[PDB]
């Protein structure tokens with residue numbers, strides 16, 4: 001899985017983009033947060049990720065969802 | 078996801094989220110999927126669980142279930 005250090009680091013990055021502190025970020029920020037952590041998903045990969053995480057159409061990504069996407073992205077690096 | 082599918086998924090999720098906190102546990106994912114007429118293998122379930130439960134809390138909420146169903150359909 002992910003370590004407790006990886007989770008802490010991902011949470012710090014995530015926190016930088018949740019500027020209202022409500023626990024979510026917009027899907028429009030996913031690429032930016034991933035790039036801040038050194039990942040460089042293509043626009044196609046990013047759009048696929050967004051369609052999936054945003055299946056409910058609320059346009060929100062929360063921290064467990066971000067970890068899931070990082071975890072999925074790290075199985076494919 | 079069609080509106081029908083989303084509706085079917087929400088009905089299924091609700092079958093298990095009887096306390097209404099919008100959350101079920103990872104232990105229940107297999108049974109939820111069976112309620113939809115699917116018979117995922119233990120290996121498939123472990124794969125889904127390891128991903129959605131990256132944070133180690135053992136919890137699945139409804140948006141996550143939808144995402145998992147969407148990802149399983151690809």
Ligand SMILES: [Mg+2]
Pocket residue numbers: 017018019020021022023024025026
């Ligand atoms: Mg926010």
Ligand SMILES: [Mg+2]
Pocket residue numbers: 053054056058059060061062140
């Ligand atoms: Mg959301």
Ligand SMILES: [Mg+2]
Pocket residue numbers: 093094095096097098099100101
């Ligand atoms: Mg519940």
Ligand SMILES: [Mg+2]
Pocket residue numbers: 064129130132134135136137138
């Ligand atoms: Mg959870």
Ligand SMILES: [Mg+2]
Pocket residue numbers: 062064065138140141
């Ligand atoms: Mg959530």
